[model samples]
Target chain A: LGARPCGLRELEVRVSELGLGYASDETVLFRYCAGACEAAARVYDLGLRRLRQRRRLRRERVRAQPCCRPTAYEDEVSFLDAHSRYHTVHELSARECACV
Target chain B: LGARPCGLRELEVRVSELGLGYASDETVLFRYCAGACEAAARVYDLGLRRLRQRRRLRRERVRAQPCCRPTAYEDEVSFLDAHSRYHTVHELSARECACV
Candidate 1:
């Protein structure tokens, strides 16, 4: 599953790495994490934008010729849930290929 | 433009919102952003996974029948650069539709 606890730990390490990179620059250590966080969000935002395009096309295909309703669209919904590490809905297994 | 500076501000706001939601729980304020950051990374990770799939298909199509080489694949590389808010390469304009 996409482990929130582990994801959080990774974020912590990433943040720590950012801090270490900027320790020489001599700015507040917090900004480094904050910067890393913002960078992450930017990455997420761009990634989501691309995913939406794929989803839009998928949506069109689904509408054009209906298939097993839930199974047909479940993957798209799953991607959104997988986006948030702390998603309250369900977790994504590691084996569950995140690719479209 | 993607506006890293502005994007950072948005992340700041998101972090602030997350903090407010969890203040009552009495957990550290940092976790909220950390969670958010991880969430962002997760989202990005998933998005990239999907993107890689799309790119793979795109790559195959391009290879199948070679056309305008650079122009055909420029969009994909641009998307990667646009993922990082602090990309040293080039910037993406607001008019540049982020969707794949």
Candidate 2:
């Protein structure tokens, strides 16, 4: 599915617009097309493959440790901050705390 | 011919080569592969199509003009220079005036 799509029509339009006028040289034109396509295809294929592979590796890592699970050696400062946030919420919900 | 080549194997090889072990998460890895392939394919397709289309147009132009005939008014400067020392009797008479 990573196959690069062809834009044949667009190329024609551009050639006309730019007035390249290479209408006499068949060999040169075709050669340009072949070379461009080959290079583009190779580079795209490589980049796509590498990106996919990286994502897979990242996924495996994240899976090895899920979120919401605290470490055995907790981040003391972060834990205190989070706990205080929850306590504040609870206190705000209490009707008696409105007077404060 | 411009279709982007699938690099499934290369992806796997790159992942392994870089020491990115993906024996854990399945979903993320698959998704990443799908996304990268999709993007790469589209870009490659556009470029290839454009290049080929240009070639086709060039061919059309070449077809419209069949050469081997000189214009009513020849290029005087070019004609004289071409008929001068640049070309010698040996050149023309090399093959019995063979203007091949």
Best by TM-score: 2
Model 1: lDDT of residue A80: 17
Clashing pairs in 1: B1-B94
DockQ of candidates 1 onward, in order? 0.02, 0.01
How many clashing residue pairs appear in each of the predictions shown? 1, 12
Q: How do the residues B1-100 of candidate 1 rate in per-residue lDDT, one tens digit apiece?
A: 3212111111112221222221222111110000011112232233223433444212211111111101111121111122333212111111121111
For candidate 1, what is the DockQ-based docking class?
incorrect
Candidate 2 residue lDDT tens string, B1-100: 4333212221222222322242222111111111012222121223234543555333311111111111122111111122232211111000110000
Which of the numbered candidates is closest to the native, going by highest lDDT? 2
lDDT of 1 at A17: 25
Model 1 chain A worst lDDT run, 10 consecutive residues: A62-71
